[PDB]
């Protein structure tokens, strides 16, 4: 709200103005009054108060006030309205301005973007935080220098990067829809001040580059001009260098020389058999809407020890006492703190506990001794601990937890007294320790605080430099085969979570030198290393230093929580930054962001890689921002992501201006829904609707919600609202159904209106992960040649249980379609009603295409939902377009409700698949339908490693569906990865014939 | 016989055995028929170093073992040999003996007459007691997180009151700095009129500072009281957790009497 506890300011309010002299002046001012108007009328009114003789000229002052974020903000940007300041109370203090104005104005804009004030970072004591802020600014200048290099083109390649598939090589079923290897494409040209445009239809090779398209168009128009070969060249040269191509209806551009069929828009136009509509556009016009945007270094940017391997002693730690522990003294017997030394998820040594202690006096003062030699500590070692209660049988429970890095970001071993506040234990966790949790102290006040002391060895202790580590390997190494070859390869085939016994892992460690001939084995070999042996670790470091690059789908496993060593993770990053395309990065960005939570320190190779890419490609930068911004509420990562967001916003250039327009749009919508969720929940639907339309008709709302980019896809501009069609929805949490006009000059060639759902109250990150995973399966099937059409509609979480969802035009639930039909049996709907409605919307020759689309899409979702355990869906959770394309919705709703059928294949579907036949399960349409399902099932099983890694990387999300690897084991059952293909195939057939029940 | 042995549980999942060696002492052990679901192939898992270390039991010519040189006649001979002596002569870095087993029925804690009502009545009772207490635990965790966020909203609000009061106090200290000797001048010029203009505005300054100071303590009061009711919701959950865990296991293992027959009829009534 514009004031604390107030949604909107009245049209006129009183503002307490504090002058540089101790006079206080009440100024009545409009809600919309700009500070320039406030300051001029204040000093105009001040002449009515004492001691005006001491006031300097109006221009020598600015306003400072307190915002609802508790920030004393200097209002250097005097052009803002009184109501946009986010004031806590309506007052203004007059001061003389100090410091760089441009910096202060820019920091405020960053604060609005990331949702927290930047000055909160200036106060942080931690040196790791201040070093991070200064030490990644070079990654920012690397990116800005690079994209400003070949201006303006390099700048356009950042804002409008080519949207292309990862490989130009078409699969046969796509190539077969080309007319003898060619594609027909239409070029449009706005040609009138009124805007009247024209079109030119072309037939060209699918692999022509954009400049060649422009050559065929100008060649087709100069057909009758009687040009010589060289004269034709010059005007081809004129137009190749003067114009570029744009997709009609959205802001996608063809700026580099990928073959035309590799641009996704056109790869799909072939796949879908639709006409590619392009617009020839002047380059000087595109570069005009790319205003120059600089990057300035901020103020903060500019202004003996012995080795671990000499310490001859075992590890010990003193656990002193606790504070603020909340426990019922008469229900709980005693408390004790549990500790363990971990490397990832594997204890480096056995756990040890304090003595049990009365709940009324949490004090131990015990030195816990650990069975590990200090030199044997790996760099990525972590102390994991919790405070546990005990209550006949004896059973324990954790009360709060906390993890600690035995080495800090400077490679030094911790020493001296330490005190950290513990975190709440997550819902449904019974394990006494939480190693996958973040390392750090809980900033929330009045929380259980635990105190420790680490041994002090007369001086600072540092981890050995890589110099001596390699020599220790040369020291220990001094202290082909056939049948063994086939087993090593036989182990690389097994999934990341396959059971790996002792004989197999030390067998890998024995043949660790032969493993570089099958680099896919590296994850298995790393889990085989005995990490509590500095001999093996040193020997292992030398192997990964020379390891052959593995491809990204395998390297991503080495960023999950089971591979915390910086050398290992560094090898994984280098794999990505040399083999991971911007296409596949943009897809896997959800996982790649949230493995940052496993990073031991703020400054690491992974964040520098993602940040570098986000600043050089504004498409992945857009979602890079929102996936971080969506987690700001979470205090376990609010700081890490906050600092990371600060850097991005400080260097993303002019796009920050657009992002803030989105943030403001969502901040307005989340406010209206919050009002409807509590202030008006107690009132009728029609009453809520009348408040909505009134509230949306207000000008300030329309000015904030009209004319901005869609967070689901910034290539979609959102113009005027169709208030005619926006509404609340029947759902209990009452989301908003919103409709914008597409302002594109040629919007009619893609869509004239853009419809989106905004839901405030529901956790959407499950639907994100599921819809993402579905898109991966669709891309796998398409690459293989299975033309199974899925509908991974757009869905984006932007914060705590709030986000956006793409509306699929011309779509209905199977429940709605059943209600369009009638009853056949006693109170029974007609099973043929689905098939009938399809024939209604698809008449004549186009009928077969709709049936094929239904059968293919249905086959896809049957395989997908089964594998992921999303079997039983309500008939209102399944949907189908007039097109005949079938898809599912509300995945989180399904997981949230599940707290018998493998997949929904009701008679209604079976009818349309068999085109309305009797005993439909015995026709040749059904015969080749289940053949599609079988091929699609084992097609995913072939890629089971990728999916298991993607879910493994989400464990730190805090999604209750992903708390431990045991949650991921379900996909090993559905894919039957502990069985061979023909066994897995028979398993899936058996399951479908339970969905059909065998009759 | 192996089929009747304490430590052979059969086709248990890796997750179900991981749930059973949780936090156990070095030397606890348990064996399965391998997850690969192939006849006559078995895996040993025991606790050592806070880890569940799996070992494959190879089988050839009716003999048994877990290394290439294969010897033993039965798995019971293989296991009891290492219940006696240390296994360190094989895979020597680990050395703990096969100390403590966990078994499939040595905890069938049904007290009295083994009527089937011990399932059809006492199981439905515990499961009812379990879902009720699980519903309360979920309700607690809901208002627990609600109260948690309403607290930090108040902590930042009072922290904002701190900055507004800091800014009004400096206003009073500058009001006395720049008005002191203008008062002293109006004092001897006999201009009580202007002196009362200045004082009338000063009183208004420190009149409003008292309103926001009061607004702060009135909010600090709501924080003190909601912060305490938050601590109560915490210790209540911590009291419900070990209970919820206890009668969950009881509900779980009262399916033993159901698994004894091994058909769903006696739960199918529910
Ligand atoms: C009736 N259903 C079950 O019984 C069931 C049992 N185990 C499961 N484990 C599992 C497997 C693969 C990926 C993730 C998980 C948690 C699932 N799957 C999910 O919950 C799920 C699926 C998604 F696609 C996305 C998200 Br988020 C969650 C279901």
PDB file of N, CA and C in Angstrom, chain A residues 345-415:
ATOM      1  N   UNK A 345      26.586 -35.612   1.144  1.00  0.00           N
ATOM      2  CA  UNK A 345      25.636 -36.375   1.926  1.00  0.00           C
ATOM      3  C   UNK A 345      26.206 -37.588   2.623  1.00  0.00           C
ATOM      4  N   UNK A 346      27.521 -37.793   2.583  1.00  0.00           N
ATOM      5  CA  UNK A 346      28.151 -38.980   3.144  1.00  0.00           C
ATOM      6  C   UNK A 346      28.963 -38.599   4.371  1.00  0.00           C
ATOM      7  N   UNK A 347      28.621 -39.092   5.562  1.00  0.00           N
ATOM      8  CA  UNK A 347      29.431 -38.774   6.746  1.00  0.00           C
ATOM      9  C   UNK A 347      30.884 -39.186   6.564  1.00  0.00           C
ATOM     10  N   UNK A 348      31.790 -38.233   6.792  1.00  0.00           N
ATOM     11  CA  UNK A 348      33.215 -38.542   6.776  1.00  0.00           C
ATOM     12  C   UNK A 348      33.623 -39.405   7.963  1.00  0.00           C
ATOM     13  N   UNK A 349      32.848 -39.384   9.043  1.00  0.00           N
ATOM     14  CA  UNK A 349      33.107 -40.228  10.201  1.00  0.00           C
ATOM     15  C   UNK A 349      31.805 -40.377  10.976  1.00  0.00           C
ATOM     16  N   UNK A 350      31.820 -41.285  11.948  1.00  0.00           N
ATOM     17  CA  UNK A 350      30.610 -41.590  12.700  1.00  0.00           C
ATOM     18  C   UNK A 350      30.135 -40.363  13.472  1.00  0.00           C
ATOM     19  N   UNK A 351      28.821 -40.278  13.662  1.00  0.00           N
ATOM     20  CA  UNK A 351      28.233 -39.163  14.390  1.00  0.00           C
ATOM     21  C   UNK A 351      28.525 -39.275  15.882  1.00  0.00           C
ATOM     22  N   UNK A 352      28.561 -38.122  16.553  1.00  0.00           N
ATOM     23  CA  UNK A 352      28.764 -38.058  17.995  1.00  0.00           C
ATOM     24  C   UNK A 352      27.818 -37.016  18.577  1.00  0.00           C
ATOM     25  N   UNK A 353      27.356 -37.274  19.800  1.00  0.00           N
ATOM     26  CA  UNK A 353      26.376 -36.427  20.457  1.00  0.00           C
ATOM     27  C   UNK A 353      26.901 -35.970  21.810  1.00  0.00           C
ATOM     28  N   UNK A 354      26.353 -34.854  22.282  1.00  0.00           N
ATOM     29  CA  UNK A 354      26.582 -34.440  23.653  1.00  0.00           C
ATOM     30  C   UNK A 354      25.825 -35.367  24.606  1.00  0.00           C
ATOM     31  N   UNK A 355      26.059 -35.179  25.901  1.00  0.00           N
ATOM     32  CA  UNK A 355      25.224 -35.828  26.900  1.00  0.00           C
ATOM     33  C   UNK A 355      23.841 -35.190  26.912  1.00  0.00           C
ATOM     34  N   UNK A 356      22.845 -35.977  27.302  1.00  0.00           N
ATOM     35  CA  UNK A 356      21.490 -35.450  27.411  1.00  0.00           C
ATOM     36  C   UNK A 356      21.386 -34.528  28.620  1.00  0.00           C
ATOM     37  N   UNK A 357      20.557 -33.494  28.481  1.00  0.00           N
ATOM     38  CA  UNK A 357      20.576 -32.368  29.418  1.00  0.00           C
ATOM     39  C   UNK A 357      19.157 -31.906  29.671  1.00  0.00           C
ATOM     40  N   UNK A 358      18.888 -31.454  30.896  1.00  0.00           N
ATOM     41  CA  UNK A 358      17.559 -30.913  31.194  1.00  0.00           C
ATOM     42  C   UNK A 358      17.169 -29.806  30.227  1.00  0.00           C
ATOM     43  N   UNK A 359      15.882 -29.774  29.886  1.00  0.00           N
ATOM     44  CA  UNK A 359      15.387 -28.754  28.972  1.00  0.00           C
ATOM     45  C   UNK A 359      15.515 -27.356  29.563  1.00  0.00           C
ATOM     46  N   UNK A 360      15.528 -27.247  30.889  1.00  0.00           N
ATOM     47  CA  UNK A 360      15.559 -25.953  31.555  1.00  0.00           C
ATOM     48  C   UNK A 360      16.955 -25.351  31.643  1.00  0.00           C
ATOM     49  N   UNK A 361      17.993 -26.083  31.241  1.00  0.00           N
ATOM     50  CA  UNK A 361      19.371 -25.594  31.323  1.00  0.00           C
ATOM     51  C   UNK A 361      20.165 -26.163  30.158  1.00  0.00           C
ATOM     52  N   UNK A 362      20.013 -25.583  28.961  1.00  0.00           N
ATOM     53  CA  UNK A 362      20.776 -26.068  27.785  1.00  0.00           C
ATOM     54  C   UNK A 362      22.241 -25.633  27.804  1.00  0.00           C
ATOM     55  N   UNK A 363      23.058 -26.390  28.537  1.00  0.00           N
ATOM     56  CA  UNK A 363      24.488 -26.112  28.629  1.00  0.00           C
ATOM     57  C   UNK A 363      25.248 -27.429  28.738  1.00  0.00           C
ATOM     58  N   UNK A 364      26.281 -27.584  27.909  1.00  0.00           N
ATOM     59  CA  UNK A 364      27.065 -28.812  27.842  1.00  0.00           C
ATOM     60  C   UNK A 364      28.543 -28.580  28.115  1.00  0.00           C
ATOM     61  N   UNK A 365      29.164 -27.619  27.430  1.00  0.00           N
ATOM     62  CA  UNK A 365      30.589 -27.327  27.582  1.00  0.00           C
ATOM     63  C   UNK A 365      31.457 -28.540  27.256  1.00  0.00           C
ATOM     64  N   UNK A 366      30.968 -29.425  26.392  1.00  0.00           N
ATOM     65  CA  UNK A 366      31.689 -30.644  26.055  1.00  0.00           C
ATOM     66  C   UNK A 366      32.564 -30.443  24.826  1.00  0.00           C
ATOM     67  N   UNK A 367      33.737 -31.073  24.843  1.00  0.00           N
ATOM     68  CA  UNK A 367      34.579 -31.195  23.658  1.00  0.00           C
ATOM     69  C   UNK A 367      34.216 -32.501  22.959  1.00  0.00           C
ATOM     70  N   UNK A 368      33.582 -32.406  21.798  1.00  0.00           N
ATOM     71  CA  UNK A 368      33.256 -33.582  21.004  1.00  0.00           C
ATOM     72  C   UNK A 368      34.464 -33.940  20.143  1.00  0.00           C
ATOM     73  N   UNK A 369      34.941 -35.174  20.277  1.00  0.00           N
ATOM     74  CA  UNK A 369      36.092 -35.662  19.530  1.00  0.00           C
ATOM     75  C   UNK A 369      35.619 -36.543  18.382  1.00  0.00           C
ATOM     76  N   UNK A 370      36.168 -36.302  17.195  1.00  0.00           N
ATOM     77  CA  UNK A 370      35.736 -36.960  15.972  1.00  0.00           C
ATOM     78  C   UNK A 370      36.829 -37.883  15.454  1.00  0.00           C
ATOM     79  N   UNK A 371      36.411 -39.013  14.882  1.00  0.00           N
ATOM     80  CA  UNK A 371      37.337 -40.026  14.379  1.00  0.00           C
ATOM     81  C   UNK A 371      37.778 -39.652  12.963  1.00  0.00           C
ATOM     82  N   UNK A 372      38.520 -38.547  12.880  1.00  0.00           N
ATOM     83  CA  UNK A 372      39.094 -38.105  11.617  1.00  0.00           C
ATOM     84  C   UNK A 372      40.328 -37.262  11.900  1.00  0.00           C
ATOM     85  N   UNK A 373      41.424 -37.574  11.215  1.00  0.00           N
ATOM     86  CA  UNK A 373      42.672 -36.833  11.339  1.00  0.00           C
ATOM     87  C   UNK A 373      42.550 -35.515  10.585  1.00  0.00           C
ATOM     88  N   UNK A 374      42.897 -34.411  11.251  1.00  0.00           N
ATOM     89  CA  UNK A 374      42.667 -33.085  10.662  1.00  0.00           C
ATOM     90  C   UNK A 374      43.232 -32.999   9.253  1.00  0.00           C
ATOM     91  N   UNK A 375      44.475 -33.386   8.973  1.00  0.00           N
ATOM     92  CA  UNK A 375      44.951 -33.386   7.583  1.00  0.00           C
ATOM     93  C   UNK A 375      44.075 -34.181   6.629  1.00  0.00           C
ATOM     94  N   UNK A 376      43.340 -35.181   7.118  1.00  0.00           N
ATOM     95  CA  UNK A 376      42.460 -35.962   6.258  1.00  0.00           C
ATOM     96  C   UNK A 376      41.170 -35.231   5.905  1.00  0.00           C
ATOM     97  N   UNK A 377      40.987 -34.007   6.377  1.00  0.00           N
ATOM     98  CA  UNK A 377      39.789 -33.251   6.035  1.00  0.00           C
ATOM     99  C   UNK A 377      39.826 -32.842   4.567  1.00  0.00           C
ATOM    100  N   UNK A 378      38.776 -33.108   3.795  1.00  0.00           N
ATOM    101  CA  UNK A 378      38.670 -32.498   2.467  1.00  0.00           C
ATOM    102  C   UNK A 378      38.250 -31.039   2.573  1.00  0.00           C
ATOM    103  N   UNK A 379      38.527 -30.293   1.501  1.00  0.00           N
ATOM    104  CA  UNK A 379      38.225 -28.864   1.505  1.00  0.00           C
ATOM    105  C   UNK A 379      36.733 -28.611   1.691  1.00  0.00           C
ATOM    106  N   UNK A 380      35.888 -29.440   1.077  1.00  0.00           N
ATOM    107  CA  UNK A 380      34.442 -29.265   1.135  1.00  0.00           C
ATOM    108  C   UNK A 380      33.810 -29.956   2.340  1.00  0.00           C
ATOM    109  N   UNK A 381      34.521 -30.037   3.462  1.00  0.00           N
ATOM    110  CA  UNK A 381      33.974 -30.651   4.663  1.00  0.00           C
ATOM    111  C   UNK A 381      33.042 -29.682   5.381  1.00  0.00           C
ATOM    112  N   UNK A 382      32.014 -30.238   6.020  1.00  0.00           N
ATOM    113  CA  UNK A 382      30.964 -29.445   6.644  1.00  0.00           C
ATOM    114  C   UNK A 382      30.568 -30.063   7.975  1.00  0.00           C
ATOM    115  N   UNK A 383      30.402 -29.212   8.985  1.00  0.00           N
ATOM    116  CA  UNK A 383      29.845 -29.622  10.268  1.00  0.00           C
ATOM    117  C   UNK A 383      28.331 -29.453  10.215  1.00  0.00           C
ATOM    118  N   UNK A 384      27.608 -30.548  10.418  1.00  0.00           N
ATOM    119  CA  UNK A 384      26.152 -30.556  10.418  1.00  0.00           C
ATOM    120  C   UNK A 384      25.668 -30.912  11.815  1.00  0.00           C
ATOM    121  N   UNK A 385      24.754 -30.108  12.355  1.00  0.00           N
ATOM    122  CA  UNK A 385      24.332 -30.305  13.734  1.00  0.00           C
ATOM    123  C   UNK A 385      22.889 -29.865  13.924  1.00  0.00           C
ATOM    124  N   UNK A 386      22.315 -30.312  15.039  1.00  0.00           N
ATOM    125  CA  UNK A 386      20.942 -30.004  15.410  1.00  0.00           C
ATOM    126  C   UNK A 386      20.805 -30.220  16.910  1.00  0.00           C
ATOM    127  N   UNK A 387      19.729 -29.678  17.476  1.00  0.00           N
ATOM    128  CA  UNK A 387      19.370 -29.900  18.872  1.00  0.00           C
ATOM    129  C   UNK A 387      18.164 -30.828  18.894  1.00  0.00           C
ATOM    130  N   UNK A 388      18.283 -31.938  19.620  1.00  0.00           N
ATOM    131  CA  UNK A 388      17.308 -33.017  19.569  1.00  0.00           C
ATOM    132  C   UNK A 388      16.680 -33.255  20.934  1.00  0.00           C
ATOM    133  N   UNK A 389      15.372 -33.491  20.933  1.00  0.00           N
ATOM    134  CA  UNK A 389      14.632 -33.882  22.121  1.00  0.00           C
ATOM    135  C   UNK A 389      14.455 -35.395  22.154  1.00  0.00           C
ATOM    136  N   UNK A 390      14.138 -35.907  23.341  1.00  0.00           N
ATOM    137  CA  UNK A 390      13.818 -37.317  23.527  1.00  0.00           C
ATOM    138  C   UNK A 390      12.616 -37.418  24.456  1.00  0.00           C
ATOM    139  N   UNK A 391      11.720 -38.356  24.160  1.00  0.00           N
ATOM    140  CA  UNK A 391      10.609 -38.652  25.057  1.00  0.00           C
ATOM    141  C   UNK A 391      10.773 -40.050  25.658  1.00  0.00           C
ATOM    142  N   UNK A 392       8.746 -47.847  28.535  1.00  0.00           N
ATOM    143  CA  UNK A 392       8.382 -47.228  27.264  1.00  0.00           C
ATOM    144  C   UNK A 392       9.569 -47.194  26.305  1.00  0.00           C
ATOM    145  N   UNK A 393       9.278 -47.142  25.008  1.00  0.00           N
ATOM    146  CA  UNK A 393      10.322 -47.011  24.002  1.00  0.00           C
ATOM    147  C   UNK A 393      10.810 -45.568  23.932  1.00  0.00           C
ATOM    148  N   UNK A 394      12.076 -45.414  23.559  1.00  0.00           N
ATOM    149  CA  UNK A 394      12.739 -44.118  23.484  1.00  0.00           C
ATOM    150  C   UNK A 394      12.824 -43.678  22.029  1.00  0.00           C
ATOM    151  N   UNK A 395      12.384 -42.450  21.754  1.00  0.00           N
ATOM    152  CA  UNK A 395      12.358 -41.920  20.398  1.00  0.00           C
ATOM    153  C   UNK A 395      12.746 -40.450  20.409  1.00  0.00           C
ATOM    154  N   UNK A 396      13.544 -40.057  19.417  1.00  0.00           N
ATOM    155  CA  UNK A 396      14.147 -38.736  19.344  1.00  0.00           C
ATOM    156  C   UNK A 396      13.479 -37.897  18.260  1.00  0.00           C
ATOM    157  N   UNK A 397      13.716 -36.588  18.323  1.00  0.00           N
ATOM    158  CA  UNK A 397      13.207 -35.650  17.332  1.00  0.00           C
ATOM    159  C   UNK A 397      14.125 -34.441  17.272  1.00  0.00           C
ATOM    160  N   UNK A 398      14.313 -33.849  16.095  1.00  0.00           N
ATOM    161  CA  UNK A 398      15.065 -32.594  16.011  1.00  0.00           C
ATOM    162  C   UNK A 398      14.189 -31.384  16.294  1.00  0.00           C
ATOM    163  N   UNK A 399      14.809 -30.367  16.888  1.00  0.00           N
ATOM    164  CA  UNK A 399      14.141 -29.110  17.205  1.00  0.00           C
ATOM    165  C   UNK A 399      14.559 -27.970  16.294  1.00  0.00           C
ATOM    166  N   UNK A 400      15.828 -27.936  15.899  1.00  0.00           N
ATOM    167  CA  UNK A 400      16.372 -26.923  15.004  1.00  0.00           C
ATOM    168  C   UNK A 400      17.724 -27.427  14.523  1.00  0.00           C
ATOM    169  N   UNK A 401      18.171 -26.892  13.389  1.00  0.00           N
ATOM    170  CA  UNK A 401      19.354 -27.409  12.722  1.00  0.00           C
ATOM    171  C   UNK A 401      20.208 -26.262  12.207  1.00  0.00           C
ATOM    172  N   UNK A 402      21.441 -26.603  11.834  1.00  0.00           N
ATOM    173  CA  UNK A 402      22.379 -25.650  11.279  1.00  0.00           C
ATOM    174  C   UNK A 402      23.626 -26.332  10.757  1.00  0.00           C
ATOM    175  N   UNK A 403      24.157 -25.847   9.637  1.00  0.00           N
ATOM    176  CA  UNK A 403      25.338 -26.423   9.012  1.00  0.00           C
ATOM    177  C   UNK A 403      26.440 -25.376   8.925  1.00  0.00           C
ATOM    178  N   UNK A 404      27.684 -25.844   8.998  1.00  0.00           N
ATOM    179  CA  UNK A 404      28.849 -24.971   9.072  1.00  0.00           C
ATOM    180  C   UNK A 404      29.935 -25.502   8.147  1.00  0.00           C
ATOM    181  N   UNK A 405      30.608 -24.590   7.449  1.00  0.00           N
ATOM    182  CA  UNK A 405      31.749 -24.934   6.611  1.00  0.00           C
ATOM    183  C   UNK A 405      33.012 -24.888   7.464  1.00  0.00           C
ATOM    184  N   UNK A 406      33.703 -26.025   7.573  1.00  0.00           N
ATOM    185  CA  UNK A 406      34.926 -26.058   8.369  1.00  0.00           C
ATOM    186  C   UNK A 406      35.995 -25.149   7.778  1.00  0.00           C
ATOM    187  N   UNK A 407      35.943 -24.905   6.471  1.00  0.00           N
ATOM    188  CA  UNK A 407      36.791 -23.922   5.813  1.00  0.00           C
ATOM    189  C   UNK A 407      35.906 -22.812   5.263  1.00  0.00           C
ATOM    190  N   UNK A 408      36.369 -21.571   5.384  1.00  0.00           N
ATOM    191  CA  UNK A 408      35.641 -20.435   4.842  1.00  0.00           C
ATOM    192  C   UNK A 408      36.120 -20.160   3.415  1.00  0.00           C
ATOM    193  N   UNK A 409      35.635 -19.071   2.815  1.00  0.00           N
ATOM    194  CA  UNK A 409      35.927 -18.795   1.414  1.00  0.00           C
ATOM    195  C   UNK A 409      37.377 -18.397   1.171  1.00  0.00           C
ATOM    196  N   UNK A 410      38.158 -18.153   2.222  1.00  0.00           N
ATOM    197  CA  UNK A 410      39.571 -17.831   2.084  1.00  0.00           C
ATOM    198  C   UNK A 410      40.470 -19.047   2.281  1.00  0.00           C
ATOM    199  N   UNK A 411      39.893 -20.244   2.376  1.00  0.00           N
ATOM    200  CA  UNK A 411      40.605 -21.508   2.540  1.00  0.00           C
ATOM    201  C   UNK A 411      41.156 -21.710   3.946  1.00  0.00           C
ATOM    202  N   UNK A 412      40.777 -20.867   4.903  1.00  0.00           N
ATOM    203  CA  UNK A 412      41.269 -20.980   6.268  1.00  0.00           C
ATOM    204  C   UNK A 412      40.372 -21.902   7.086  1.00  0.00           C
ATOM    205  N   UNK A 413      40.983 -22.592   8.046  1.00  0.00           N
ATOM    206  CA  UNK A 413      40.241 -23.441   8.969  1.00  0.00           C
ATOM    207  C   UNK A 413      39.680 -22.592  10.103  1.00  0.00           C
ATOM    208  N   UNK A 414      38.397 -22.791  10.414  1.00  0.00           N
ATOM    209  CA  UNK A 414      37.753 -21.978  11.435  1.00  0.00           C
ATOM    210  C   UNK A 414      38.392 -22.239  12.797  1.00  0.00           C
ATOM    211  N   UNK A 415      38.408 -21.204  13.636  1.00  0.00           N
ATOM    212  CA  UNK A 415      38.985 -21.294  14.968  1.00  0.00           C
ATOM    213  C   UNK A 415      38.315 -20.271  15.876  1.00  0.00           C
TER     214      UNK A 415
END
